[PDB]
C-alpha cells in the first residue's frame, strides 16, 4: 500500500480557513479527513490528482479544535494516515501585522512566533511554551536560513523550560528574507515545528 505522508503542514488563511499541505515520499490521489476533536461530523475531501498536495478548508469554527488526517490511495489500497490537531484562535498592542488577529495552535507546538527587529542586522524571537508537550521539555531547536535557498542553516539550542523563551539572532544580512523554524525537544523527542519567514526593514 502507499506510504504514509511524510509531512503535514498547516497555514491559517483567516479566522475560519486554513491551507493543509502534505508531502509523499503511482497513486490515484489522496483523502483529507477532518472533524471537530469532540464528536463532530466527519468531513472527507477526495483529491483526484496525485500532483495536488494542498487544499484550502473553509468554514471552520474559530477557537475549536479539529483533527485532520491525510492518506494516499493506490491500486493496492489506502495507506496509513498522517494526523494533526489544529485550532485557529482569534478574539471572541503588538505591531499590527496583517493576519495578526488570528493564529494557528496545536497542543505540542511552540506558541506563535513573536519577532522584534532590534537593528538592521539583528532580531529577537520569542515563543510561548507548548501547552501540552509530549513529555517534559528539555529545550528548543531554532534554525535560521536564507529563505531563497543556497546557503547553510544556523541552528541554535535554547536550553530550559521557561514559560516564555527568547533568542537573539545576530549577523542577518540587511533586507534579506530569512526562514525560521522552532521546535520543542522533549524527553520523548521532537515536537511539531513552527515556521515563518521574516525580512528586517
Amino acid at each position: 500500500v502507499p506510504d504514509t505522508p511524510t509531512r503535514l503542514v498547516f497555514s491559517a488563511l483567516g479566522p475560519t480557513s486554513l491551507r493543509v499541505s502534505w508531502q509523499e515520499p503511482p497513486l490515484q490521489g489522496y483523502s483529507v479527513e477532518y472533524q471537530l476533536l469532540n464528536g463532530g461530523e466527519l468531513h472527507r475531501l477526495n483529491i483526484p490528482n496525485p500532483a495536488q498536495t494542498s487544499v484550502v478548508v473553509e468554514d471552520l469554527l474559530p477557537n475549536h479544535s479539529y483533527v485532520f488526517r491525510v492518506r494516499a490511495q493506490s491500486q493496492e489500497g489506502w495507506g496509513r494516515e498522517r494526523e494533526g490537531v489544529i485550532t485557529i484562535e482569534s478574539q471572541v498592542p503588538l505591531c499590527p501585522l496583517p493576519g495578526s488577529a488570528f493564529t494557528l495552535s496545536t497542543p505540542s507546538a511552540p506558541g506563535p512566533l513573536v519577532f522584534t527587529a532590534l537593528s538592521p542586522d539583528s532580531l529577537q524571537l520569542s515563543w510561548e511554551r507548548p501547552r501540552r508537550p509530549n513529555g517534559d521539555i528539555v529545550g528548543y531547536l531554532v534554525t535560521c536560513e536564507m529563505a531563497q535557498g543556497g546557503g547553510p542553516a544556523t541552528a541554535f539550542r535554547v536550553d530550559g523550560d521557561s514559560p516564555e523563551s527568547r533568542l537573539t539572532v545576530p549577523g542577518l544580512s540587511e533586507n534579506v528574507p530569512y526562514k525560521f523554524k522552532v521546535q520543542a525537544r522533549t524527553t520523548e523527542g521532537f515536537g511539531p515545528e513552527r515556521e515563518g519567514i521574516i525580512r528586517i526593514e
Binding site: 509531512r7 503535514l8 497555514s11 508531502q23 505591531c95 506563535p112 515563518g196 525580512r199 526593514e201
Partner: peptide, 24 residues
C-alpha cells in the same frame, strides 16, 4: 512564499507561522 516584514523599533510583532508535523 509569505514574508513578514519587520520594522526596526516597532517592537514585538506577531507573525503568521505554519505548523508542520513530520520532517521536510
Amino acid at each position: 512564499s509569505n514574508e513578514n516584514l519587520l520594522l526596526v523599533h516597532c517592537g514585538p510583532t506577531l507573525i503568521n507561522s505554519c505548523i508542520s508535523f513530520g520532517s521536510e
